[PDB]
Design an enzyme around this catalytic site. Structure first.
Site, PDB file in Angstrom:
ATOM      1  N   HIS A  46       0.809  -1.224   0.000  1.00  0.00           N
ATOM      2  CA  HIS A  46       0.000   0.000   0.000  1.00  0.00           C
ATOM      3  C   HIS A  46       0.844   1.276   0.000  1.00  0.00           C
ATOM      4  CE1 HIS A  46      -0.004   0.487   4.578  1.00  0.00           C
ATOM      5  NE2 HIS A  46       0.054   1.744   4.178  1.00  0.00           N
ATOM      6  N   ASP A  97      -1.079  -7.120   1.807  1.00  0.00           N
ATOM      7  CA  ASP A  97      -0.301  -5.891   1.911  1.00  0.00           C
ATOM      8  C   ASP A  97       1.175  -6.221   2.186  1.00  0.00           C
ATOM      9  OD1 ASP A  97       0.078  -3.147   1.872  1.00  0.00           O
ATOM     10  OD2 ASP A  97      -0.686  -2.815   3.881  1.00  0.00           O
ATOM     11  N   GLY A 196       2.776   6.309   8.737  1.00  0.00           N
ATOM     12  CA  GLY A 196       4.208   6.442   8.572  1.00  0.00           C
ATOM     13  C   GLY A 196       4.987   5.236   9.087  1.00  0.00           C
ATOM     14  N   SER A 198       3.779   2.175   8.528  1.00  0.00           N
ATOM     15  CA  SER A 198       3.438   1.113   7.588  1.00  0.00           C
ATOM     16  C   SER A 198       4.691   0.557   6.927  1.00  0.00           C
ATOM     17  CB  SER A 198       2.493   1.626   6.504  1.00  0.00           C
ATOM     18  OG  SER A 198       1.270   2.070   7.074  1.00  0.00           O
TER      19      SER A 198
HETATM   20  N1  LIG Z   1      -1.974   0.628  14.393  1.00  0.00           N
HETATM   21  C1  LIG Z   1      -2.890   1.551  14.107  1.00  0.00           C
HETATM   22  N2  LIG Z   1      -3.872   1.822  14.965  1.00  0.00           N
HETATM   23  N3  LIG Z   1      -2.851   2.230  12.965  1.00  0.00           N
HETATM   24  C2  LIG Z   1      -1.957   2.058  11.991  1.00  0.00           C
HETATM   25  O1  LIG Z   1      -1.170   1.132  11.914  1.00  0.00           O
HETATM   26  C3  LIG Z   1      -2.060   3.048  10.885  1.00  0.00           C
HETATM   27  N4  LIG Z   1      -2.813   4.134  11.129  1.00  0.00           N
HETATM   28  C4  LIG Z   1      -3.008   5.094  10.212  1.00  0.00           C
HETATM   29  C5  LIG Z   1      -3.841   6.234  10.686  1.00  0.00           C
HETATM   30  C6  LIG Z   1      -3.374   7.506  10.966  1.00  0.00           C
HETATM   31  C7  LIG Z   1      -4.433   8.269  11.401  1.00  0.00           C
HETATM   32  C8  LIG Z   1      -5.551   7.466  11.412  1.00  0.00           C
HETATM   33  O2  LIG Z   1      -5.182   6.209  10.989  1.00  0.00           O
HETATM   34  C9  LIG Z   1      -2.401   4.955   8.958  1.00  0.00           C
HETATM   35  N5  LIG Z   1      -2.539   5.859   7.879  1.00  0.00           N
HETATM   36  C10 LIG Z   1      -3.549   6.928   7.848  1.00  0.00           C
HETATM   37  C11 LIG Z   1      -3.960   7.254   6.408  1.00  0.00           C
HETATM   38  C12 LIG Z   1      -4.549   6.075   5.629  1.00  0.00           C
HETATM   39  C13 LIG Z   1      -3.962   4.707   5.958  1.00  0.00           C
HETATM   40  C14 LIG Z   1      -2.435   4.660   5.815  1.00  0.00           C
HETATM   41  C15 LIG Z   1      -1.690   5.642   6.720  1.00  0.00           C
HETATM   42  N6  LIG Z   1      -1.654   3.836   8.724  1.00  0.00           N
HETATM   43  C16 LIG Z   1      -1.462   2.880   9.653  1.00  0.00           C
HETATM   44  N7  LIG Z   1      -0.699   1.789   9.360  1.00  0.00           N
END
Ligand SMILES: N=C(N)NC(=O)c1nc(-c2ccco2)c(N2CCCCCC2)nc1N
Length: 246
Positions: A46, A97, A196, A198
């Site tokens: 992703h 992913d 960030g 990810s």
């Molecule tokens: N462990 C968790 N609770 N969350 C995460 O791992 C996580 N969270 C978010 C996120 C940030 C703000 C709300 O959700 C996030 N994003 C936000 C924009 C679209 C998706 C990809 C990047 N990526 C993630 N991997």
């Protein structure tokens, strides 16, 4: 990473920091990754699916800070960017992913292990730690969901593996989490991965060495109650991984 602690690359020497170059020549951070062999970094599809041109990516190893140099860091170009053919994105979740970046220095070399750079072991297929096991996550991702900036210093924290039974409850993620995913969270919901982080590692001791059990994939919010971090279940993807690394 929400909560947790600042760290240096020596405590997570497999961590890879992945950036993208932009036409102006501005370079911005994309995602984390993990070095699983000298020439290969594993991450999340992703992160790259929107711009899948390999020539625009830069991978750092041995790097402890986001926007400045760390002594002993190594810079690599991406010789092959391999995104999963069955990747898909739903409303919350991502499926399959998982991505591989074949790394090569402009000098034509792969990673050479050091105080700041080491490979991380892969799990045996369909072998995972028991639920309740404490594992480590690492990254340059947001320190709060609502933040605009990423931290300048690498972070790490500890989270515990949650059962699918628990993660699949309607007030957790219901139908959206599958058996090719793993959930992990803090028992008090204080610490978590976030935007960030990810593509970065979820590392657990399995047998007697640190092992790449998960790849940071998605979650609703960050560190939100009843909403665990969700991770690609690496133990389900060994044939995929071996097909490209052979
Ligand atoms: N462990 C968790 N609770 N969350 C995460 O791992 C996580 N969270 C978010 C996120 C940030 C703000 C709300 O959700 C996030 N994003 C936000 C924009 C679209 C998706 C990809 C990047 N990526 C993630 N991997």
């Amino acid at each position: 990473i929400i909560g947790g602690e600042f760290t240096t690359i020596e405590n997570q020497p497999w961590f890879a920091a992945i950036y993208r170059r932009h036409r102006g020549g501005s370079v911005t951070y994309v995602c984390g990754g993990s070095l699983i062999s000298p020439c290969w970094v594993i991450s999340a599809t992703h992160c790259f699916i929107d711009y899948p041109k390999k020539e625009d990516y830069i991978v750092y190893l041995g790097r402890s800070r986001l926007n400045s140099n760390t002594q002993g860091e190594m810079k690599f170009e991406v010789e092959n960017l391999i995104l999963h053919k069955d990747y898909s994105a739903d409303t919350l979740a991502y499926h399959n992913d998982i991505a591989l970046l074949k790394i090569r220095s402009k000098e034509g070399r792969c990673a050479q292990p050091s105080r700041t750079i080491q490979t991380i072991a892969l799990p045996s297929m369909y072998n995972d730690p028991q639920f309740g096991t404490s594992c480590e996550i690492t990254g340059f991702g947001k320190e709060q969901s609502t933040d605009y900036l990423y931290p300048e210093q690498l972070k790490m924290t500890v989270v515990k593996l949650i059962s699918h039974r628990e993660c699949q409850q309607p007030h957790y993620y219901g139908s959206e989490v599958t058996t090719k995913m793993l959930c992990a969270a803090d028992p008090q919901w204080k610490t978590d991965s976030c935007q960030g982080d990810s593509g970065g590692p979820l590392v657990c001791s399995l047998q007697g060495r640190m092992t790449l059990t998960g790849i940071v994939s998605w979650g609703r919010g960050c560190a939100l109650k009843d909403k665990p971090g969700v991770y690609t279940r690496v133990s389900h993807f060994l044939p995929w991984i071996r097909s490209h690394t052979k």
